[PDB]
Amino acid sequence: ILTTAASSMLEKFSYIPEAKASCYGQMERPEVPMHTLHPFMVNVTWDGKD
Amino acid sequence: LRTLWGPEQAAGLPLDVNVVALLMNRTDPKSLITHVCDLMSGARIHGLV
Amino acid sequence: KIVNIGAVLSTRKHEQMFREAVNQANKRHGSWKIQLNATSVTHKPNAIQMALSVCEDLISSQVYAILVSHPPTPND
Structure with a gap:
């Protein structure tokens, strides 16, 4: 499921918003400019099972 | 071995997917802080199961 | 017996107000062996x-x- 979401990323982007670094700092903001998997987790099919 | 079989199964991944797994028994937030923050320090892990 | 009670503020003068109200609580209608120690975090x-202070400092002190x-700006 995650790899079809990542393939839909590689369709609609060619880059990935990386995970955060530390739990102990907030550097700039939480601006999700590269648009994480919530439209990309919409369509997932595997092996005859949606 | 399950990850290796999933990798050799299908949809052969231009992304080099790498998985870090552990076994615990805790409902404990310091365990959450240690495990989660140390894995976020390590290479910014992107998937969660 | 010892009941630790926390407080999240931005200041510490009102944390001292909590401490003096804990003194009042030990005085008013609630008595007497030892049942309270002070915990208060900005x-x-x-x-x-x-949650660093919460588990390492508050839950470790059994709050x-x-x-x-609200917050230190209270409006974001």
């Missing part, structure tokens, strides 16, 4: 963290209840 600069303000 707001943290990293809003990710927010039953925490009295929480």
Whole structure:
């Protein structure tokens, strides 16, 4: 499921918003400019099972 | 071995997917802080199961 | 017996107001062996963290209840 979401990323982007670094700092903001998997987790099919 | 079989199964991944797994028994937030923050320090892990 | 009660503020003068109200609570209608020690924490600069003092400092000191303000800006 995650790899079809990542393939839909590689369709609609060619880059990935990386995970955060530390739990102990907030550097700039939480601006999700590269648009994480919530439209990309919409369509997932595997092996005859949606 | 399950990850290796999933990798050799299908949809052969231009992304080099790498998985870090552990076994615990805790409902404990310091365990959450240690495990989660140390894995976020390590290479910014992107998937969660 | 010893009941630790937390407080989340931005200041510490009102944390001392909590401490003096704990003194009042030991005086008023509630008595007497030893049942209270003082715990009071300001707001943290990293809003990710927010539980370091709680587990390391409050739950480790067995805090039953925490009295929480909005934020250090209180409007974000």
